[PDB]
């Protein structure tokens, strides 16, 4: 039961990661249209598509992909929030220019 569940959840996770990468690409393109070339690889999250291909005798854990001090909420979410704050500061600057 958990193997079928894990296969389904892994497929859903891969789809969600692709959606996140597409959204990051769109945000980077929009920022570059305004002159701010955002590093696409910096915001993108890298997950091995062959992670589930391992034999189940070997463990898979959150710390393997997101060790302590580098999780999505720990660093990536904070980095994206800082990017949003910088975008708001640039919004204020462009409003001042307007």
């Amino acid at each position: 039961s958990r193997k079928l569940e894990a296969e389904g959840i892994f497929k859903s996770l891969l789809d969600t990661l692709r959606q996140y990468d597409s959204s990051i690409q769109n945000l980077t393109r929009s920022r570059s249209q305004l002159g701010h070339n955002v590093n696409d690889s910096s915001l993108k999250i890298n997950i091995s598509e062959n992670l589930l291909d391992r034999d189940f005798h070997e463990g898979i854990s959150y710390e393997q992909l997101f060790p302590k001090g580098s999780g999505i909420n720990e660093s990536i979410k904070k980095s994206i929030l800082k990017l949003n704050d910088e975008i708001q500061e640039r919004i204020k600057t462009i409003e001042k220019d307007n």
Binding site: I80, I87, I91, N98
Partner: protein
């Protein structure tokens, strides 16, 4: 959700503000057209006639 509603939404507002900036720049260029090649040119010809 944060991107689409807060980050990318802020970027969309920033793009709209940049478009407004470009529109204001175009309006300014039109004012220099009406001013330099216009109201200063009209001033020059009027002063020449006077």
């Amino acid at each position: 959700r944060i991107i689409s509603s807060e980050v990318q939404e802020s970027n969309r507002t920033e793009t709209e503000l940049v478009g407004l900036k470009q529109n204001l720049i175009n309006n300014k260029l039109k004012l220099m057209n009406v001013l330099e090649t216009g109201i200063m040119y009209k001033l020059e010809i009027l002063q020449e006639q006077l």
